[PDB]
Design a protein around this motif. Structure first.
Motif: not given
Lengths: 265, 290, 117, 118
Positions: B82-88, B102-109, B94-98, B26-35
Motif C-alpha cells: 500500500h502506497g501513499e494516497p495520491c490524486s490523479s 498553490e496546489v494544496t491537498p485541500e484544493y485538490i479535494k 495514472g497521472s501523479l498530481i504534485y 471564478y478566477p480563484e480556481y485557476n491553477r497550474a497543477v504539476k503532474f
C-alpha cells in the motif's frame, strides 16, 4: 471543453501478481513463525476457503487489489499425529481422516519443528510405548531424544525431570518390558554417576522371580561364588551365567567388571 | 465551477513531469497543477530496496498498471504494498498530481468533490523481498539444488533451515548417495536422521551409511543402532553382522557391551564402526589385551 | 597358556587339493569358536571359514563349496580341506580360536601358520 | 609371620553400620584376591565379599548393596563397610587371602565379632 484524454500503458504482471493459493500447498506448509508467505491476489470470496484450509495461519492483507500473504500463528498438531514419528511435520484432515498427501478440501495441521525436544511428546509416548503399540524404532529413538538433554528447551528439561521420575517409578515394578529395557540401555549409554545409581536402584527394586530369571550374573549361587575365588580373574569373565546374559539387566558393578577382563592375545 | 480553458505545458526539469494549466470561471480556481506520468522501465531502485514509479493507481484500476514500468526479470523479487494516497486526473488515469506551491491537498479535494476531474488513489509502492514460489515443482527444483536460478534464500541455503526437510525426506530415500542429500543429513535434524535410519535399515552395506554413522554419533546414536538392528535381522548371512547379531540360535547377544572385547575382530580399527552398536563401540577403548 | 600349531600346508600345482590341520594345546578349559584366516604378502587378512561349538560351519563367499571345515573335540583339532585350488589362494593360513584358559581367563588367540602356495 | 588381623566389629542395632578393617603384613594386594568371610555360631563359614588383584569386587547376594568391600593399596588394608545391618548378619567376620596363581597360598586371619540385637 477538450480534455487531453490519455490511457495508461498496458500493465505487465509480476511473479507476485501471478501466484495461486491452490498451487502453494508445499510452500505454505513448511512456513515458520513471523514468515510472510505471499500468496498473491486473492478474491474476497475465496478468503473464507483459504482461511478454513490453513487455520494455523492468518490472512494478512499486504498490497492493493487483493494481494495477501499467510502468516503462521500456531502449530496445531495433535500428539498422536506429531509424536509417533520423526519424519512427518504436517498432515491433512479430511472428513475426519488424517492423510499425508494433500486434498483440495483437506485442512493443513502442522507439527512443532523438533517437537520431541520440546517435551510435549513425553506424556503421549510414555503411554504409547508402554503397551502392545510399542514400536521398537520409534520408542528407542524417543528414549534417545530424552537423554539428549542439551537439545531440549526449558520446558523440555522440566518435562525430562518428570519423565525420569515417572520411568523410575514404572520400571521398578518390572524391567523386563521393552520400554524399560531400552531405558536401561540408554542409561548405560549415558554413563554418569546418576545414571549408574538409577540403573542400580531399578534393578534392586525388582521382584525375586525377575532376579532369578535375569540377574543370575549379579546374584550368583553360593557354590559359584565359592568357586570364583579359586581364580585371579573376576567371576564375570568365566561365569556362564555372565557369558550369555542380557547386558541391560546387569548391575553397574557387574557391567564394569565385565570390561576389566584380561584377554589372552 | 465549470472549466473554461485547459492545456498541458512541458516540464522545466524532468521530461516525465508536466503542468496541467486549468482556468475555470471564478478566477480563484485557476491553477497550474504539476503532474507526473511515468515512462521508464525500471531495472534498478529509486530508493534503497524500494521502487516508486511515478504513477497513481486510482481506486479500481488494474494492478498490472503499477508494474508496467518494471523489467519482468527484475520484478521477480519485489512485492506491491500500500502506497501513499495520491490524486490523479480522471481523464488521464495514472497521472501523479504534485502538491506544489498553490496546489494544496485541500484544493485538490475540492476539485475532486466539485469537478469530476480528479480521482483519489494509491501510489505504486514496491518493496524488495525474496523470490516468490508458487508452484509445487519450484520447491523441488530449489531444494534438490538442481535449478537455483530463481530460488528464495529459505529454499536455497544448503539446508540451514527446516523448509526443505519435507521434500528431502522423500528425495533422499530414493537417492541416498546424493552429495546434497548428505549435506542435508549433516544438518542433524530429526527428519533427516530418521530418513537415513530407514534407509540404512535396508541398505547398511553402502558407504553413505558409513558417513551416516560417522555423522550421527555420538550425540544421536539411536538411529544407527536401530538401523543396524533391522539390517542384521534382515541380512543375517552377512559376515559384518557377526558382532551385532551372532548367528547361533538363542545367543545372538554374545558380544554386547563389554563382551565386544572378547573377540578381537570386533575391535579392529580395520573394521568399520557402522557394524557395532554405540554401547559396543565405546567399550573398544577399554579392552585389556594381554 | 594357549598354543596353536598349524600343519599340512605346502606347495601344489594350480587346481589341486590340500588339507590343513590346527591343534590347540596348553591350559584350555573351553574352545568356543575356531576359524581360519588368510594373509597374502602385501595384502591384509581375509576370513576363510569358521566352525562353532557343535560342528556348525560358516564359509566365506570366496571359497564356498570349494573348502570344507570340520572339528574334532575328542582331540581338540580343526581340519580344513581345500579343493579346486587357484593361484590366487597363494597366501599363509592361520587358525583363530576363542575360549577360556585353564585358569578361567578369556583368550582370543591366533597361531603362526604354515605357507600355502 | 603373615598378619591378617581383623578389627572394627562390635554391637550395633538393626540398620546401623560398621567398618571392619584388615591390614595385611606379608601379603601384597597386587598379587592376592582378598575376601571377607563370616561364620555364625552353629553354621559354617560363608563368603561375604571379595576383591581380585584389580578393583573387581563381588558380593554375596544376601548382603549385596548393603556391604561394600574397599581396598587401600598404599596402606595395604581391606575394609568392609556394612550398612543396614540385620540380625542375620551377626557372626565372626574374618579376612582371607588367596594368591593369584599359587593356589596353595591361602591365608586366613583372626576374626572379629559383629552382633545385631533386635
Amino acid at each position: 471543453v477538450e480534455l487531453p484524454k490519455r490511457d495508461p500503458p498496458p500493465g505487465v504482471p509480476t511473479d507476485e501478481m501471478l501466484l495461486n493459493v491452490d498451487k502453494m500447498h508445499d510452500v505454505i506448509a513448511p512456513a515458520k513463525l513471523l514468515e510472510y508467505v505471499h500468496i498473491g491476489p486473492l478474491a474476497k470470496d475465496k478468503e473464507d476457503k483459504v482461511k478454513k484450509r490453513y487455520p494455523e495461519f492468518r490472512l494478512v492483507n499486504t498490497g492493493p487489489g487483493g494481494l495477501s500473504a499467510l502468516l503462521r500463528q500456531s502449530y496445531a498438531g495433535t500428539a498422536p499425529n506429531c509424536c509417533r514419528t520423526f519424519q512427518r511435520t504436517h498432515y491433512w484432515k479430511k472428513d475426519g481422516k488424517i492423510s499425508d498427501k494433500y486434498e483440495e478440501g483437506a485442512v493443513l495441521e502442522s507439527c512443532w519443528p523438533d517437537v520431541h525436544d520440546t517435551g510435549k511428546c513425553d506424556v503421549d509416548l510414555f503411554d504409547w510405548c508402554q503397551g502392545d503399540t510399542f514400536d521398537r524404532n520409534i520408542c528407542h529413538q524417543w528414549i534417545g531424544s530424552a537423554f539428549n538433554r542439551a537439545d531440549r528447551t526449558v520446558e523440555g528439561q522440566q518435562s525430562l525431570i518428570n519423565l525420569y521420575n515417572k520411568m523410575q517409578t514404572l520400571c521398578s515394578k518390572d524391567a523386563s518390558v521393552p520400554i524399560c529395557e531400552s531405558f536401561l540401555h540408554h542409561l548405560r549409554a549415558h554413563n554418569t554417576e546418576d545414571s549408574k545409581e538409577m540403573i542400580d536402584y531399578i534393578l534392586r527394586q525388582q521382584s525375586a522371580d525377575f532376579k532369578q530369571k535375569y540377574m543370575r550374573c549379579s546374584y550368583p549361587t553360593r557354590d559359584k561364588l565359592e568357586e570364583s575365588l579359586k581364580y585371579a580373574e573376576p567371576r564375570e569373565c568365566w561365569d556362564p551365567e555372565c557369558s550369555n546374559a542380557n547386558v541391560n539387566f546387569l548391575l553397574t558393578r557387574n557391567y564394569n567388571n565385565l570390561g576389566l577382563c584380561n584377554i589372552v592375545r | 465551477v465549470t472549466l473554461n480553458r485547459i492545456k498541458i505545458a512541458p516540464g522545466i526539469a524532468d521530461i516525465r513531469d508536466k503542468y496541467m494549466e486549468l482556468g475555470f470561471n471564478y478566477p480563484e480556481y485557476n491553477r497550474a497543477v504539476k503532474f507526473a506520468e511515468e515512462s521508464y522501465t525500471y531495472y534498478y531502485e529509486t530508493s534503497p530496496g524500494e521502487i516508486k514509479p511515478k504513477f497513481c493507481l486510482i481506486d479500481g484500476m488494474s494492478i498490472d498498471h503499477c508494474s508496467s514500468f518494471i523489467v519482468p526479470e527484475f520484478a521477480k523479487q519485489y512485492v506491491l504494498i500500500h502506497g501513499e494516497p495520491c490524486s490523479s486526473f480522471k481523464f488521464r488515469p495514472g497521472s501523479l498530481i504534485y502538491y506544489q506551491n498553490e496546489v494544496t491537498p485541500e484544493y485538490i479535494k475540492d476539485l475532486k468533490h466539485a469537478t469530476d476531474y480528479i480521482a483519489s488513489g494509491q501510489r505504486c509502492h514496491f518493496i524488495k523481498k525474496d523470490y516468490l514460489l508458487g508452484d509445487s515443482d519450484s520447491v523441488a527444483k530449489c531444494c534438490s539444488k538442481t535449478n537455483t536460478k530463481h530460488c528464495p534464500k529459505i529454499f536455497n541455503n544448503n539446508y540451514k533451515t527446516e523448509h526443505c526437510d519435507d521434500f528431502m525426506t522423500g528425495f533422499c530415500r530414493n537417492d541416498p548417495g546424493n552429495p546434497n542429500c548428505l549435506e542435508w543429513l549433516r544438518a542433524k535434524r530429526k527428519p533427516a536422521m530418521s530418513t537415513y535410519s530407514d534407509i540404512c535399515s535396508k541398505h547398511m552395506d553402502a558407504r553413505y551409511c558409513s558417513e551416516f554413522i560417522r555423522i550421527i554419533r555420538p550425540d544421536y546414536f539411536t538411529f544407527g543402532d536401530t538401523a543396524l538392528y533391522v539390517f542384521c535381522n534382515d541380512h543375517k548371512g552377512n559376515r559384518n553382522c557377526w558382532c551385532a547379531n551372532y548367528p547361533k540360535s538363542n545367543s545372538g547377544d554374545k558380544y554386547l557391551g563389554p563382551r565386544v572385547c572378547w573377540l578381537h575382530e570386533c575391535t579392529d580399527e580395520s573394521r568399520d564402526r557402522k557394524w557395532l552398536y554405540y554401547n559396543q563401540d565405546v567399550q573398544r577403548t577399554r579392552c585389556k589385551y594381554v | 597358556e594357549v598354543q596353536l600349531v598349524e600343519s599340512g600346508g605346502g606347495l601344489v600345482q594350480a587346481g589341486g587339493s590340500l588339507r590343513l590341520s590346527c591343534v590347540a594345546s596348553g591350559s584350555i578349559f573351553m574352545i568356543d569358536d575356531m576359524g581360519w584366516y588368510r594373509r597374502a604378502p602385501g595384502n591384509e587378512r581375509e576370513w576363510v571359514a569358521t566352525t562353532h561349538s557343535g560342528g556348525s560351519t560358516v564359509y566365506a563367499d570366496s571359497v564356498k563349496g570349494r573348502f570344507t571345515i570340520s572339528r574334532d573335540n575328542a582331540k581338540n583339532t580343526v581340519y580344513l580341506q581345500m579343493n579346486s585350488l587357484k593361484p590366487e589362494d597363494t597366501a599363509v593360513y592361520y587358525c583363530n580360536a576363542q575360549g577360556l584358559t585353564g585358569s578361567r581367563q578369556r583368550y582370543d588367540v591366533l597361531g603362526q601358520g604354515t605357507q600355502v602356495t | 609371620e603373615v598378619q591378617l588381623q581383623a578389627s572394627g566389629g562390635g554391637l550395633v542395632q538393626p540398620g546401623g553400620s560398621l567398618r571392619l578393617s584388615c591390614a595385611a603384613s606379608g601379603i601384597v594386594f597386587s598379587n592376592n584376591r582378598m575376601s571377607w568371610y563370616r561364620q555364625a555360631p552353629g553354621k559354617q563359614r560363608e563368603v561375604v565379599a571379595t576383591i581380585t588383584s584389580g578393583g573387581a569386587t563381588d558380593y554375596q547376594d544376601s548382603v549385596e548393596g548393603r556391604f561394600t568391600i574397599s581396598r587401600d593399596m598404599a596402606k595395604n588394608t581391606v575394609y568392609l563397610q556394612m550398612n543396614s545391618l540385620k540380625p542375620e548378619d551377626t557372626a565372626v567376620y574374618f579376612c582371607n587371602a588367596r594368591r593369584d596363581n599359587f593356589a596353595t597360598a591361602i591365608y586366613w586371619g583372626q576374626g572379629t565379632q559383629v552382633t545385631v540385637s533386635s
